[PDB]
Every structure is written in structure tokens, then in C-alpha cells.
């Protein structure tokens, strides 16, 4: 027995048919560390280590430690080994997560050598971090005082400190934290594992050290391997770390305790930060929340609840979701759904955008609706739709760019971490069949009504939360923090303050001084020869069906067909452009002459894997004419391809644009969505503003997704009551302008047998379309004026952007630009914008189709300081000495981004986009060879190209009113002020 000779006892072993894997549970004899080793033919290998880390306060220790362990370890004594992996590895996944009760460290890769490189850095980080040796990392990642000069105010700074101020300022994050903590006041979930900014400064390095000593011990660890690598070698890898420890009792300390269910419901009123120039009376929220049980529920109940959650909320047609939204009492759902990832399952439901006087009504509606579902039950067509949809997704197992092995780990860990069976959550074929059988034999009412009745309606463990906008909350919090720090300063002697100002300057210089290439040599990399000279092969065949371009990709898809039908919106009247996204929504959430929208949705849910309709807009390298499309993206079993294309035609051609009230609710939902895009994702808004000033593709998207769209939405509610017939006929001319056989493109991904069978369905679908669209043939120009702009929101944190067109310098695209851009992001901007500056993140974005090079920051306390960092990028590049090993790493890191692992639908889709944007296979290959040969000269050449962004680039910021005038007083009339 190889295992036992390496110190591991094999506990349990099963074949899981669901994931075609042999899964083995080992236990390290000496420490008791448990290892789930899952072998299969999946080349996207996955590793993770998870520690059970319940906090006992809101100081944020687990979260701070999660950041700190990745800042240097025994074998990797450099500032930030995590970023070195980000820079120079072929990973498919690289991250770290702090959950309320556990901290996870996962990596993935298709390349076995790369995989084991990543695994070693992670193992050494969590077990032998440098952050427990002295306080420096703790201070940087956690909290420290900063004083620029004894004459000035002291401030609090730190990665996690700043991150949590960001978080605690987003209304929806506030609500979910209030709910979790109010539901579970007597265990670890009653406190914040990420850290409350009011409490983070109470944390001492000593507490932080002890937390690591106790909890980051193999005895308290669970380890996951998944994939096609050698099973025995996994244990050999682990023995290096596991053998270096003795058994520890800490798992007895880390065990999570159940919250005993309340005997009476709880009612709470809480504040979130709001803007003053906004009608506060209208932006309340109401959420009702439950803890569903104390006992771990039987495995059939767990499945049945997940099914129930989908049945009530899975689609726009699902009754709870549908009834709440059509009430008109709110703008959108909030903190809604089942969550079962923690010890006890929790269900919540609520609305945001509720008027003050309607809050009791939302509560009454929620309760009435839930009672109605228990009493009347669910129609069998709804139940069949959920069952097909669910069975389809489990079979497809489409995790996107998230590894399948990681998704499995997280399912296993959700029970394993509470000392329950780690195999059980991986299984679903048998439980699902049994549920299906109960529904046929007893009916949905007998299956689902008792769950609603006893776990929800008759459950006194209920928390109701009303959230109210507070225009002063944020100012008052800044006031308390300032007064706290003024007393800190007042309590210090002149020399205490000189010492702190010196520690400040010392820290700033340390984090602005990169580790030299000599140091970074401890982190290994692949050879440039370990890298395929060719791109990932995707079988494309260009063909022709009913006078229409068709792309076929012959790939194993597990008997699923993926189709995209691409219509052109290049010549849509400009007045129609901003209505395109609501047009797409109307196709999917209105009925036909013959069917209601519920009946159509249920047909789609019963027969297919879903259909979506969305705009796509991009520049095309070499032309002024943009690629501007609406895409209808559908999937089904190959045997239901016929039903898929029938339903797509039904959506496209038969839906009637007559539902005024549903259209009004789309508007409100969209307004809600845009408003919190601005708040928590303003960098996407700035990027859109800037592109809109620079090219037609950019201007078009911003009409449909930026500031211009939000502005358009406000004009729209008057237009919907006063002139519905105008809106409806606009919707109808968009359809007329787009639905045509001529210049349509059809993308198909499925195995070769399915494709043949599918073409008959495609041919028939194409037959039913008009030949030519209505409207013009010309793509008419649009642009926003080039202006520096600042967009005002209520926030603590900003989002700062700068961009310009680097092709305008006469710089010509070379693949080295991809390498350099990635390097800029992970070195200069990482070090200055995030670490030194205090932003959650900073990065650059190169659109090689338009030539626009953009700088962006995310949740940034600064504004003009950030723009200054952006301007210094050319000198950084010019100042660089990059040895061959540095070049090699930057190259590998870019090739990893380019060779990123894709499931077959993503392959065929990426191939579609290359065709649309004119990227031929010989262009791909030429660009890859340019990537593989990037040199020091390239870095210097590129410096001169991006200096045009410094000299002639435009800045757009989404920021505080305070910071906008503060900056407009330092640089007079720099930013034009948009409210």
C-alpha cells in the first residue's frame, strides 16, 4: 500500500457516476488532515485547501489572514507570491475566499507542471507564511496608522480596512449582513468574518498570530484534489507539509454550533447610506428572512428545497418572483432566494425601491403569496419546466470559466466542513429520480406545501428587515472615525508623532520598491519551450444554408446543441438604439397572440436549456464600420433541436409588444440595476463613457449601457404612460430592422452527427424570416464630445479612468502589447493603485480592435493621485530592466490568458466572435508568435505609444461630490460635473 507508506489511511472510496470520477477519502494518520482525491479524465486539474476558521468577533481576522498568508512564505520570501503566480503561470483559476466559517485556497490548471508549481506556492503560503514572523504584513493587510506629517491628521489604512469600508457602503451588502447576523446571533455568523471597519483597529498582531497558530494547522484542514494527474503523487506532494506537524486539538475549537430557532419573529429597521439629491421617500427596502431548520435536513428535503427555490424564483415567470414584481410595490427583488452553503439553510425574499408608506404591504404580499403557493400549489407545466431545466443543467455542467472541479469541491466542502459526508452532496441522479417519482405519485402540493408550511409559514424563526435611506449615515461615520483619531494624536508626544511620520514614509517606500528580478527567481516558471506554438484547435467549418453564412464546430458536447443566431443592428435608427436592451427583455418576458408570457417561458423551460437575446458591439481592426449585433443564443438536447428553433422563431416573430405594465416594470428594474452599477462598479461606467468619446462601437454601447442609458431610462416612464403606442411601435420597428435572412449568421456547436440532424431545423428557421430587413443600409456616426468628466454618486470609494487611442500615434498592433499590458496591470498598477494607493484594484485594458488603451481603478479612495499614477506608466516601462526570466514569465502569463480553458460552447462562441471581428486563424497565429518573441525593446517601444494617453487621453471618474470639488479646486475646471 503506497498510501499507508506515505502516512495516509484510506477511509472511503466510491465511484461517482455523476462526475465520472473515482473519489477517495484519505486521512493523514499523524495529524488527522483529510484529503479528498478525485480522479477522472478532466484535464482542468483543481486543488484547494480549506481551513475551518470561525471568528468570535468582527475584527476581520480570517479575512486579514487570507490576504496576509499570500504575502511571503518560507520557500517564497518575496513581497507577494500570489501576484507572481498571477504574472507568470498558465493557471485556469487562481484565488482565495473567506466565507463566514471557512477560508478556501483553490488553484486550477490544464498543464500538470504548472499545476504543481501553483499547488506548492499555496501549500507553503498557508502553512509557513512570513506574516507571523513580524507585524509588517499584518499592518499593511490589516490596519495601521498613517501620518504624512505631525502637523496633519492621522488616518487608518490597510488593505482589508479599506476593502471593508467599500463593502459597508453598498446598500445590498449592508442588508445581507444585517440578515445573516440577525438570523444567527448566537454563533459565528452573528459576527462579520470579513471585518467591520469600526472594529478592525481593535485587532492586534498577537491575536492574528494565535488565530493562524490554532486554525491553519493540518488537523483543521481539508484538502481537495481533482483531475487527471497521478493520484499517488498528490499524497507525496502533501507529505512534505503534513509530516512537518504534530496532531492538534484545534478542530474541537473550530467546530460550528447550530443556532437554536427563535420562539418569536424579529422585526428590524436599519439605515443605509444615501444621496441627498434623491427622493428618499421612494428608496426603502423590505426583506423577510428565515432560518429553515436546526437539524440537518434529510437529503430528499434538501433537493426538494432547491427545486422549490427554482420553482418560486428561477425565472421571470416563477410565481413568487412574478407576483412580487408585478405588484408595482418595488423596483426589483433583493436578497432573495435559498442559501444552503452554511450550517443551517436560510431563505430570504424582499424588494428594493419601495415607498416608505408601502413597506407593510410588501410584507403582507410576501406572506399572502407564500400562503397561496402552499394552498393552491404549482401547476404541473411549471413543475415540468423546473424539472427539465434542472436536469438539463446538471447534465450539461456548464460552469463557464469556473473549473468543474472547483464547483464540485465547493459542493463537497459545504457538508464536509461541518463533519458530514463529503461524497453525498456530489450525488444527485438517485435523489432526483426519487423526487420525480414522488411528484408523479403524490402531486406537487403534497411534496412542496409541507415545506412551505412548516419551514417558512409556520416558522417563527423569521427576521423582517426594513432598510431606510440615510443621507447623513456616511458623514456621521467619518465624523466618529476622525474624532477617534484626533484623540489618538492628542495622546501622543511630539516624538511619538515624528516616529509615526517616519514609519509612514518608510512603509510608502517599501511598497513602492519592487522586489528585484534576482528575488523573484524563487518562484519557478515553465520553459518557453513547454508552450505549444499553436493556438487551441477549434474545428470550424464555414458553410451556407438558405443563402446564409453558417459556422459549424464539431465538438463533443454530450448530445447538446449550442446555437447562436446573429442579426445586424448596425443601421438601426439612433433614436432606437437605447431601446435595444428593453427590446431584448420584451422578446423574453411578453406573450404572443396565442400564449401568455408564462406559457411561452414554461415551453422554453420544458423543451430547451434556455434562450437569451442580447446586443453585442465592438470595433473591427482596420475599419471604421463597427460590428453591431443582436444575438439569439439557444441550447437544447440534440433531440429537441426542432423545438429549440421553433421556440426561437416564436420569440422573435410572434411575441407582441403590447404589455404596457410589464414594460413599466422592466424600466424600474433597469433603473435599479444601473443605479447600483454606478455605486459598486463605476469603473464599467467610466470605461463606457470614454469609449463613447473615442469610437462608434463605444458610443453605441454607452447608449445601451452607460450614463446615457440611465438618462434615457428616466425619460421613459413618462413616455410609457403618456405614449405607450409610440413605444410599442418603436419596439416593432427594431424587430422589422433586424429580423432578416440577409446578412444573418448562424453558429452551431455540437458533435458531427447532431450537426447534420440540426441543419434541417436551421434551414426551416431561416425560411420563416423575411429576406431583407426594413430601414436604412448605412451605419450613421455618433460620438460624445471629448471632455474630462466626473460623475457624482454617493460613495466613499471612487472609480478613476483614463484612455486614448494608441493607433493614432501610428503604433501598429504587435502581440507584445498583450504581454506588456498584462505586465503593467500586475506590477505598476498593482503596486501603486492597490497596495500603495489603497484601492481595491487598478488595471489597464487594451482593446486591440479599436486601439483604445484604458486605465481603470476599482473602489479607489483617491482621484487625481490615481491619474498621476496612470501618467507615470511610460517612465515605469522605460525604467525597467527585464531579464530573460522576467520576459519569459510575462509571456507565459499572457499565453495562459490566451490559451484559457474553455468548455465546447465557449470554444464555438469565441470562434464566432473571431469571425465577426475579422480575426483569421493566420492572424491568431501571427499574433501568438509575436507574443512568444516579445523582447525588452517592445517594452520601451510601447512606452511611447501609451504616453499619448498621458498627453492626449481623456479622464472620466465616478466619485464623491466632495472628491470632485476637492479635485476641481486643486486642478481648476479639470472635471466637467455630471450629476
Amino acid at each position: 500500500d503506497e498510501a499507508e507508506k506515505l502516512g495516509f489511511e484510506k477511509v472511503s472510496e466510491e465511484f461517482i457516476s455523476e462526475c465520472k470520477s473515482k473519489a477517495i477519502l484519505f486521512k493523514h494518520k499523524k495529524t488527522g488532515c483529510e484529503v479528498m482525491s478525485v480522479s477522472n479524465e478532466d484535464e482542468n486539474k483543481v486543488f484547494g485547501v480549506v481551513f475551518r476558521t470561525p471568528p468570535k468577533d468582527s475584527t476581520g481576522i480570517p479575512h486579514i489572514l487570507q490576504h496576509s498568508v499570500l504575502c511571503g512564505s518560507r520557500k517564497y520570501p518575496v513581497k507577494e507570491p500570489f501576484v507572481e503566480l498571477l504574472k507568470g503561470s498558465l493557471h485556469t483559476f487562481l484565488n482565495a475566499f473567506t466565507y463566514p466559517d471557512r477560508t478556501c485556497y483553490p488553484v486550477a490548471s490544464t498543464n500538470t507542471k504548472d499545476f504543481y508549481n501553483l499547488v506548492d506556492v499555496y501549500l507553503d503560503a498557508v502553512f509557513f507564511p512570513k506574516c507571523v514572523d513580524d507585524a509588517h504584513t499584518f499592518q499593511q493587510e490589516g490596519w495601521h496608522y498613517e501620518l504624512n506629517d505631525p502637523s496633519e491628521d492621522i488616518s487608518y489604512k490597510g488593505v482589508v480596512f479599506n476593502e471593508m469600508k467599500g463593502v459597508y457602503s453598498q446598500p445590498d451588502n449592508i442588508l445581507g449582513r444585517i440578515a445573516q447576523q440577525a438570523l444567527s446571533p448566537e454563533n459565528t455568523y452573528g459576527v462579520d468574518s470579513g471585518g467591520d471597519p469600526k472594529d478592525i483597529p481593535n485587532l492586534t498582531f498577537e491575536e492574528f498570530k494565535e488565530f493562524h497558530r490554532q486554525y491553519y494547522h493540518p488537523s483543521n484542514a481539508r484538502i481537495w484534489f481533482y483531475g487527471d494527474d497521478d493520484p499517488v503523487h498528490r499524497l507525496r506532494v502533501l507529505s512534505e507539509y503534513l509530516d512537518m506537524f504534530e496532531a492538534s486539538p484545534s478542530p474541537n475549537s473550530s467546530k460550528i454550533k447550530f443556532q437554536k430557532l427563535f420562539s418569536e419573529p424579529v422585526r428590524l429597521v436599519e439605515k443605509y447610506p444615501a444621496g441627498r439629491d434623491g427622493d428618499l421617500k421612494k428608496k426603502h427596502m423590505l426583506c423577510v428572512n428565515w432560518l429553515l431548520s436546526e437539524k440537518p435536513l434529510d437529503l430528499q428535503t434538501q433537493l426538494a428545497l432547491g427545486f422549490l427555490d427554482h420553482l418560486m424564483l428561477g425565472t421571470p415567470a416563477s410565481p413568487l418572483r412574478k407576483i412580487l414584481l408585478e405588484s408595482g410595490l418595488g423596483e426589483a427583488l433583493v436578497s432573495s432566494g435559498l442559501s444552503d452553503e452554511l450550517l443551517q439553510p436560510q431563505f430570504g425574499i424582499g424588494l428594493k425601491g419601495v415607498s416608505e408608506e408601502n413597506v407593510q404591504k410588501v410584507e403582507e404580499l410576501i406572506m399572502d403569496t407564500l400562503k397561496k403557493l402552499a394552498e393552491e400549489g404549482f401547476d404541473n407545466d411549471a413543475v415540468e419546466a423546473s424539472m427539465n431545466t434542472i436536469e438539463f443543467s446538471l447534465r450539461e455542467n456548464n460552469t463557464g470559466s469556473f473549473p468543474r472541479g472547483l464547483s464540485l469541491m465547493l459542493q463537497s466542502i459545504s457538508k464536509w466542513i461541518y463533519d458530514m459526508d463529503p461524497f453525498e452532496p456530489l450525488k444527485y441522479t438517485e435523489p432526483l429520480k426519487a423526487l420525480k417519482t414522488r411528484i408523479a405519485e403524490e402531486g406537487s402540493k403534497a411534496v412542496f406545501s409541507p415545506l412551505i408550511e412548516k419551514l417558512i409559514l409556520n416558522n417563527s424563526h423569521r427576521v423582517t428587515i426594513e432598510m431606510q435611506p440615510d443621507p447623513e449615515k456616511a458623514t456621521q461615520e467619518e465624523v466618529e472615525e476622525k474624532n477617534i483619531l484626533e484623540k489618538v494624536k492628542a495622546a501622543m508626544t511630539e516624538e511619538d508623532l515624528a516616529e509615526l511620520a517616519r514609519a509612514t514614509e518608510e512603509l510608502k517606500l517599501k511598497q513602492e520598491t519592487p522586489d528585484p528580478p534576482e528575488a523573484l527567481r524563487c518562484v519557478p516558471s515553465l520553459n518557453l519551450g513547454d508552450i505549444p506554438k499553436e493556438p487551441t484547435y477549434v474545428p470550424t467549418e464555414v458553410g451556407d444554408i438558405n443563402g446564409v453564412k453558417v459556422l459549424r464546430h464539431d465538438l463533443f458536447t454530450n448530445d447538446i446543441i449550442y446555437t447562436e443566431v446573429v442579426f445586424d443592428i448596425g443601421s438601426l435608427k439612433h433614436e432606437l438604439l437605447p431601446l435595444v436592451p428593453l427590446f431584448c427583455q420584451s422578446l423574453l418576458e411578453m406573450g404572443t397572440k396565442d400564449l401568455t408570457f408564462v406559457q411561452l417561458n414554461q415551453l422554453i423551460g420544458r423543451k430547451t436549456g434556455g434562450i437569451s437575446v442580447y446586443p453585442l458591439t465592438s470595433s473591427v481592426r482596420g475599419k471604421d464600420e463597427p460590428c453591431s449585433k443582436i444575438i439569439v443564443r439557444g441550447k437544447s438536447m440534440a433531440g429537441r433541436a426542432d423545438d429549440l428553433f421553433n421556440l426561437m422563431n416564436c420569440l422573435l416573430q410572434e411575441v407582441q409588444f403590447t404589455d404596457q405594465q410589464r414594460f413599466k416594470q422592466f424600466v424600474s428594474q433597469s433603473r435599479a440595476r444601473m443605479e447600483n452599477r454606478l455605486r459598486g462598479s463605476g469603473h464599467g461606467i467610466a470605461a463606457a463613457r470614454m469609449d463613447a468619446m473615442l469610437n462608434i462601437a463605444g458610443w453605441m454601447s454607452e447608449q445601451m449601457g452607460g450614463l446615457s442609458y440611465l438618462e434615457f431610462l428616466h425619460t421613459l416612464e413618462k413616455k410609457v404612460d403618456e405614449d405607450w403606442e409610440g413605444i410599442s411601435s418603436s419596439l416593432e420597428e427594431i424587430r422589422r430592422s433586424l429580423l432578416a435572412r440577409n446578412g444573418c449568421i448562424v453558429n452551431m456547436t455540437a458533435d458531427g452527427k447532431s450537426l447534420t440532424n440540426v441543419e434541417k431545423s436551421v434551414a426551416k428557421f431561416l425560411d420563416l424570416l423575411p429576406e431583407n430587413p426594413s430601414g436604412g443600409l448605412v451605419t450613421w456616426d455618433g460620438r460624445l464630445p471629448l471632455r474630462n468628466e466626473a460623475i457624482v454618486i454617493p460613495t466613499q470609494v471612487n472609480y478613476v479612468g483614463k484612455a486614448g487611442n494608441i493607433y493614432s500615434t501610428g503604433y501598429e498592433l504587435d502581440g507584445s502589447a498583450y504581454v506588456i499590458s498584462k505586465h503593467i496591470s500586475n506590477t505598476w498598477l498593482w503596486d501603486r493603485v492597490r497596495v500603495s494607493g489603497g484601492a481595491y484594484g487598478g488595471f489597464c485594458d487594451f482593446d486591440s480592435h479599436s486601439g483604445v488603451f484604458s486605465y481603470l481603478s476599482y473602489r479607489d479612495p483617491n482621484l487625481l493621485k490615481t491619474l498621476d499614477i496612470y501618467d507615470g506608466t511610460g517612465d515605469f516601462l522605460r525604467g525597467l530592466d527585464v531579464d530573460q526570466e522576467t520576459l519569459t514569465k510575462a509571456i507565459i502569463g499572457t499565453i495562459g490568458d490566451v490559451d484559457s480553458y474553455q468548455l465546447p460552447d465557449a470554444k464555438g462562441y469565441s470562434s464566432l466572435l473571431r469571425h465577426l471581428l475579422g480575426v483569421t486563424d493566420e492572424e491568431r497565429q501571427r499574433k501568438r508568435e509575436e507574443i512568444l518573441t516579445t523582447s525588452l525593446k517592445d517594452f520601451k517601444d510601447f512606452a511611447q505609444a501609451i504616453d499619448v494617453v498621458r498627453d492626449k487621453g481623456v479622464a472620466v471618474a465616478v466619485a464623491s461630490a466632495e472628491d470632485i470639488d476637492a479635485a476641481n479646486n486643486e486642478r481648476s475646471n479639470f472635471f466637467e460635473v455630471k450629476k
Binding site: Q66, L70, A96, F97, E163, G176
Partner: peptide
């Protein structure tokens, strides 16, 4: 909850 590094 889930708080990430990158």
C-alpha cells in the same frame, strides 16, 4: 458571503 483576494 465570499470575500476574494483578486
Amino acid at each position: 458571503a465570499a470575500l476574494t483576494r483578486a
